[PDB]
């Protein structure tokens, strides 16, 4: 459907890099910054992933990266980047996350670039679906929503 | 559903590493070794890809690697491998190839490890769908079938 700020976040089922099922409850009690990309194997999406992960206080909450990349791509990316502190989750099987959050590019079977921030109660306190022609998501706005919780 | 030796090769629509559509007709007039993999970003599948590519004469026919990997992962694999003579194709979008050739692992939305050898008029002259828990395909038998055409 469409996610509106103020609404409770819908649950989803995605896969970790070890092929385990992950749902929103696996991060119970934490704030979340959910960064959605078309592919981690593209340059702009790489840069988005790295910047949210470096800039967001991970002592205070969780940064999720969600894409239609296979789990095997996402695991290889983390190894290649030399980062073991970066959570990547794969919506490839079902587009559970993408359908529930309204970010599927249907003609591509890829997820649209987007950002959600959820408070510790899964209240949606920020949303950006990145527009046509826009260089990057608004890092600062999302990061401020996250830090304010 | 099930392609058997002596049947004709179905059509398919897949993507090349630059997101161009590719179909059976784009390889008209040539014999084909089609190597199917769950993901090029796994070790066993990396080795399968490299072995068929190295051991099959490409003065002889075409060696195709098909998986559900995104095009971006396949592009990155070729680039990082320094392999500019390996054809990788992505069935991610629609599973056109995997459904037509009967090789989807439907509970995972990945392609089963499998090998089809096609003569120049697209008769299937050799097939293996690799059994669950067997180490590798029979490289020698498929390569023999290919070389014999």
Swiss-Prot record, chains A, B:
**What EC number(s) does the entry state?**
1.11.1.24
What PROSITE patterns has UniProt attached to this entry? Answer: THIOREDOXIN_2, TPX
Q: Looking at its record, which EC class is this enzyme?
A: oxidoreductase
Gene Ontology MF, one: thioredoxin peroxidase activity
| General remark | The active site is a conserved redox-active cysteine residue, the peroxidatic cysteine (C(P)), which makes the nucleophilic attack on the peroxide substrate. The peroxide oxidizes the C(P)-SH to cysteine sulfenic acid (C(P)-SOH), which then reacts with another cysteine residue, the resolving cysteine (C(R)), to form a disulfide bridge. The disulfide is subsequently reduced by an appropriate electron donor to complete the catalytic cycle. In this atypical 2-Cys peroxiredoxin, C(R) is present in the same subunit to form an intramolecular disulfide.
* Family listed: Belongs to the peroxiredoxin family. Tpx subfamily.
Query: What protein name does the entry list?
Result: Thiol peroxidase
Organism, scientific name: Staphylococcus aureus (strain COL)
